[PDB]
């Protein structure tokens, strides 16, 4: 009968597939591709979970900071996503893809140049990732009490973004884009352990750092006070992680210490990893909002939506909601002093919510969308491509003209 | 130098660059940026040859910004940090620049229009108490832009680093009800050029790297006569792509970021500014004037400041005005456009006209006593000395 | 229901309701906001344009366009959305059923009347219509046939004397100086303290400041020295972001432009001389009747101290024998609509309409004959 649309959120770490109308994706696979190490030999490849285990194949990660770097592989990564996993005849199903805000236009052009010419799709919509994550939260919210106005923090593996949304419209010229994400946290734990805990095989340092990050890590109120708690009372704060070697099948054990709070700290002290960035995320959010119009500053502080897998850290919003309320209650205090102290202005109600769906938040906002009829109007079309060309998909809301 | 030998000094005290010199000067003595830099330790940089003071200022800071945390005291014509602004004035009056004695000199200053009053009162409070200047005057940036051009009638366009203001004059009669300010200038462009370079992967987050992008702007960026023709060049060719080498040796490449950044003076919505550009604002300022004065404004449009030095700005400005004259005055009569007389004074010395005009008004009024504002007057009256200028303060 | 409808269509506000009623049913600003960003969240009632209070709720992401300026309509496409928002959404009535009574200031271009009457029939299919002067309706609500009205709104300010239902058009005077010219002047002097308001939305904030803290000074030069000495007039205002401001001298310098337009550069004379000079153009016999029956109208006349400053200045010009009595009812912001419900509720008025068939035979130019 009438067929639903295909939805694909190709992220740095993990890739989210499925068809519209559904609540959770049909597949969630790493954004990896295993190749051998002319003719039909370019088809000897595997992607996803079928790529890690392959011994005689080389695993490649074609996506960095949300952008694609090798379109020779991503054109092979997408022809298994369609013909193996989804099993879709692309000439029938429309498509919804996702980009980060700072995706170059030439990457949007080569995307559409691939889908429309190679795969011959009849439609395509390249949406912004974190914007779809806000529509998902509104379903958790009461019906009718939907807050169209909200701020979004979407941090995954590649890059972190702060995107305000006011009355449904995206304030694109105030977006910020922090390059710190779950890959920088992982390589920082992968560093601390190489210095202290030798005995981790080099092939299993990454596997060991994600495991520490996902399980043991957390967020601290103050940094230097945690170092003392780990030193003065070490039995309570130092955990232990037993792994398994893949060659000898013998166990290896380590002690998990300062890397429990030091990884996530780079959200707030990003000069730990990247010296080209110093501002915390608690301050990036204040500049995003204070650069927005004066009327939608209060509703944006009151709905700050954490999305992405690298916001699952324990006590992430509790500190962000606290670093802001310090910053917001002072600014109002200073104005009250310069004016003359005659009016005590109303305080601002900061609120940082962390909604139930994070591993497939962006996909869900793409499935709700694609299941509408409005999607089939804004979708660029095969006809429009033949006439106007691949520059039909050149523009994004982050810029004008 | 006046009759009494007292040197007469002219300091612009701009938002991005200081222009200091003496009266009658046809150039300025020193032109240096208005920044103050304190030392800092960074892991990437290693230097132990040059001594780094605790307070570096001006050219010796911007040159050594790699080892510094620079900070601009002034923003959008307004002074934020006085303790960093006095350290700049000292450098401006010291052995490194204009080694003068303040107690035996006269000074002429400038403030932009429709600024707060406490920013003017607090400057005069500083020149008579801290430096104890003998004679002070606070001029209008527009009127000075005419003295250098040798005029009495002309709508001024003065765009700098923080402020872009428009002030019409007619035979020396101020019309402050027509003064307008656009909130866009060379600093709001320099930010937009970083937000564009960020798409290529170049990150300039630090305070020192803000100057590095200014130099990238002053060198490469320009204005497009017909923005459609420029977009064809960037889509069809790759000749606009230039290269800039940074202090750390890293090379970058800059293309369509050259005409897109300063287009925010004419399409200001690209930086989240609601309103109209410098052309549709200059045409609407004139159309507010008395109908008999409009004919002499089009003939005497005067540019100034260093944000008017984008290659192609006056030609672009002449174009957009004639499109509006055709569309709103003439209602679409191309045949009458030949009679439309417009002349945009774009002299290449328009970078310093607010200073040159201050050299001209000083040399004309150096030897008069009813013009300046004396230390004795400030001791007696206080900030009410400004009533000589007509500025109502108490 | 066969009740007639009434619509003021001022420069700033649209006051609407039914005939026979005592106060209007719908009051909203005459603005049409179009967004300034690209809405990527789909299926979220993201419309191409917003009107009325739905715009002021979303002013942050919009460019508010007043389609009327100094009484004239500049954008007719947007003005259809205003009337369409009035009938279908606010009043919830079809316009073809009832008639409508419109208003207009004097000495406007004839093309403005020609277009309204063309729109009510060809677009809305009204059965008839009528176009009245705004000042004349203010006297119907005042319960008089003798008196000079000074309606001061958002864009226009005009005087109209009448004597026993006989209007003197040779004495009518208009002055393009009103609240929107004062709002803009307030934004220019607020920079002196350090408060910058440029955006259209920020212009609506300053409007709320103007109509909450600005008063008229009985003696301008006297209160000028009061503020210089003390800090009694220093009132404060809380912006929606939580910031706070304080204004002293700027509370009475804004409305003084009505009495000293030289601040705005305008060569014109103040309202205190305009209404006086109008009276001097009337007959010498009827001046005394108008010095007593001096009425005010329009939202701009809601400043405190406006009645006392007019009475003071008028007394200083006119002879000491004539007694100056100002009339300033506490509903003068809606007087022009109140008279409209009165005038349409009369039996004598049922013939002054311009029916559908009369416009069909004479075209839109009939408005010049029917509507004075």
């Amino acid at each position: 009968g009438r067929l639903p649309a295909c939805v694909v959120d190709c992220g740095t770490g993990y890739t989210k597939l499925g068809y519209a109308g559904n609540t959770e994706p049909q597949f969630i696979i790493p954004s990896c591709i295993a190749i051998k190490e002319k003719g039909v030999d370019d088809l000897d490849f595997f992607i996803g979970d079928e790529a890690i285990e392959k011994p005689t194949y080389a695993t490649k990660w074609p996506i960095r900071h949300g952008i694609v770097e090798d379109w020779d592989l991503m054109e092979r990564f997408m022809e298994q996503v369609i013909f193996k996993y989804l099993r879709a005849e692309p000439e029938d199903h429309y498509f919804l893809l996702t980009e980060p805000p700072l995706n170059t236009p030439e990457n949007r052009e080569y995307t559409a140049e691939i889908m429309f010419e190679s795969f011959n799709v009849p439609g395509l919509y390249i949406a912004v990732q974190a914007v779809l994550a806000l529509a998902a939260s509104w379903t958790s919210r009461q019906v009718g009490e939907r807050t169209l106005t909200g701020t979004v923090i979407d941090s995954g593996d590649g890059v972190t973004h702060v995107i305000p949304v006011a009355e449904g419209y995206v304030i694109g010229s105030c977006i910020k884009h922090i390059p710190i994400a779950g890959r920088d946290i992982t390589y920082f734990i992968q560093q601390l352990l190489r210095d202290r805990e030798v005995g981790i095989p080099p092939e299993q340092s990454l596997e060991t750092a994600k495991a520490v990050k996902e399980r043991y890590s957390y967020v601290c109120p103050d940094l230097v006070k945690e170092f003392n708690k780990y030193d003065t009372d070490g039995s309570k704060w130092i955990k232990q992680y037993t792994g398994i070697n893949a060659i000898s099948k013998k166990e290896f054990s380590i002690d998990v210490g300062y890397e429990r709070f030091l990884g996530p700290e780079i959200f707030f002290h990003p000069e730990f990893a990247n010296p080209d960035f110093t501002q915390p995320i608690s301050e990036v959010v204040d500049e995003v909002i204070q650069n927005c119009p004066i009327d939608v500053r209060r509703p944006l502080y009151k709905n700050i939506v954490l999305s992405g897998g690298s916001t699952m850290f324990r006590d992430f919003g509790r500190r962000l909601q606290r670093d802001l309320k310090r910053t917001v209650d002072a600014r109002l205090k200073l104005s009250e002093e310069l004016s003359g102290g005659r009016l005590k202005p109303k305080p601002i109600d900061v609120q940082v919510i962390t909604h139930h769906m994070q591993r497939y938040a962006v996909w869900f906002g793409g499935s709700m969308l694609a299941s509408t009829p409005e999607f089939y109007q804004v979708c660029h079309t095969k006809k429009d491509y033949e006439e106007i060309g691949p520059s039909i998909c050149r523009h994004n809301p982050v810029f004008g003209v | 130098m006046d009759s009494q030998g007292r040197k007469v000094v002219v300091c612009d005290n701009g938002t991005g660059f200081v222009k200091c010199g003496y009266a009658g000067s046809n150039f300025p003595e020193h032109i240096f940026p208005a920044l103050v830099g304190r030392p800092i330790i960074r892991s990437t940089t290693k230097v132990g040859n040059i001594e780094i003071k605790d307070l570096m200022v001006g050219d010796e800071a911007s040159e050594l910004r790699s080892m510094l945390e620079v900070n601009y005291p002034m923003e959008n014509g307004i002074v934020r940090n006085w303790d960093d602004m006095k350290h700049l004035w000292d450098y401006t009056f010291g052995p490194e620049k204009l080694n003068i004695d303040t107690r035996n000199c006269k000074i002429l200053l400038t403030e932009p229009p429709m600024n707060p009053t406490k920013n003017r009162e607090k400057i005069v409070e500083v020149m008579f108490e801290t430096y104890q200047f003998s004679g002070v005057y606070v001029a209008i940036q527009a009127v000075l832009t005419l003295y250098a051009q040798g005029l009495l009638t002309g709508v001024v366009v003065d765009s700098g680093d923080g402020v872009t203001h428009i002030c019409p004059v007619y035979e020396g009669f101020s019309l402050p009800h027509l003064t307008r300010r656009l909130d866009i200038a060379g600093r709001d462009i320099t930010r937009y050029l970083i937000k564009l370079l960020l798409l290529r992967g170049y990150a300039f987050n630090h305070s020192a790297d803000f100057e590095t992008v200014r130099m990238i702007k002053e060198k490469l960026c320009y204005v497009g006569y017909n923005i459609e023709q420029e977009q064809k060049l960037a889509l069809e060719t790759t000749v606009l792509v230039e290269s800039y080498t940074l202090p750390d040796g890293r090379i970058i490449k800059v293309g369509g970021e050259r005409f897109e950044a300063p287009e925010a003076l004419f399409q200001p919505h690209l930086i989240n500014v609601e309103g109209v550009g410098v052309a549709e604002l200059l045409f609407n300022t004139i159309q507010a004037a008395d109908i008999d004065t409009r004919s002499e404004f089009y003939k005497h449009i005067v540019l100034s400041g260093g944000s008017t030095m984008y290659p192609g700005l006056p030609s672009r400005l002449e174009r957009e005005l004639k499109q509006l004259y055709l569309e709103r005055v003439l209602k679409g009569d191309v045949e009458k456009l030949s009679k439309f007389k417009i002349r945009i004074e774009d002299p290449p010395r328009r970078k310093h006209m607010v200073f040159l005009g201050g050299a001209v008004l000083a040399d004309i009024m150096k030897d008069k006593d009813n013009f300046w504002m004396t230390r004795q007057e400030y001791q007696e009256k206080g900030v009410r000395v400004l009533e000589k200028l007509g500025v109502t303060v108490r | 229901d066969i009740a007639a409808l009434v619509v003021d269509n001022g420069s700033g506000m649209c006051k609407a309701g039914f005939a026979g009623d005592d106060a209007p049913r719908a009051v909203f600003p005459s603005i049409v906001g179009r967004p300034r960003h690209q809405g990527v969240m789909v299926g979220m009632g993201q419309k191409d344009s917003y009107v009325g209070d739905e715009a002021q709720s979303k002013r942050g992401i919009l460019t508010l366009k007043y389609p009327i300026e100094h009484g004239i309509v500049t954008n007719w496409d947007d003005m259809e959305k205003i009337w369409h928002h009035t009938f279908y959404n606010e009043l919830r009535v079809a316009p073809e059923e009832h008639p409508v009574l419109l208003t207009e200031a004097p000495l406007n271009p004839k093309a403005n009347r020609e277009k309204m009457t063309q729109i009510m029939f060809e677009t809305f299919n009204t059965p008839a219509m009528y176009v009245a002067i705004q000042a004349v309706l203010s006297l119907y609500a005042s319960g008089r046939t003798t008196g000079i009205v000074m309606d001061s709104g958002d864009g226009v300010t005009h005087t109209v004397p009448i004597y026993e239902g006989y209007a003197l058009p040779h004495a009518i005077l208009r002055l393009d100086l009103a609240g929107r010219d004062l709002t803009d002047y307030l934004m220019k002097i607020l920079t002196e303290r350090g408060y910058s308001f440029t955006t259209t939305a920020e212009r609506e904030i300053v409007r709320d400041i103007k109509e909450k803290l600005c008063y008229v000074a009985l003696d301008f030069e006297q209160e000028m020295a009061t503020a210089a000495s003390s800090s009694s007039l220093e009132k404060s205002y809380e912006l929606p972001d939580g910031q706070v401001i304080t204004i002293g001298n700027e509370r009475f310098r804004c409305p003084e432009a009505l009495f000293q337009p030289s601040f705005l550069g305008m060569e014109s004379c103040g309202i205190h001389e305009t209404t006086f000079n109008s009276i001097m153009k009337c007959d010498v016999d009827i001046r005394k009747d108008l010095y007593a029956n001096t009425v005010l109208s329009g939202g701009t006349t809601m400043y405190p101290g406006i009645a006392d400053r007019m009475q003071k200045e008028i007394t200083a010009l006119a002879p000491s024998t004539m007694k100056i009595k100002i009339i300033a009812p506490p509903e003068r912001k809606y007087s022009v609509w109140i008279g409209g419900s009165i005038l349409a509720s009369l039996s004598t008025f049922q013939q002054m309409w311009i029916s559908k068939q009369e416009y069909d035979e004479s075209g839109p130019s009939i408005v010049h004959r029917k509507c004075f």
Binding site: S335, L338 | M74, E75, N76, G77, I78, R80, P116, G162, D183 | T191, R193, G194, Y195, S196, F197, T198, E202, L239, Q243, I245
Partner: peptide
């Protein structure tokens, strides 16, 4: 500035 804009 004090209100509106930074300066």
């Amino acid at each position: 500035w004090x209100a509106x804009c930074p300066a």
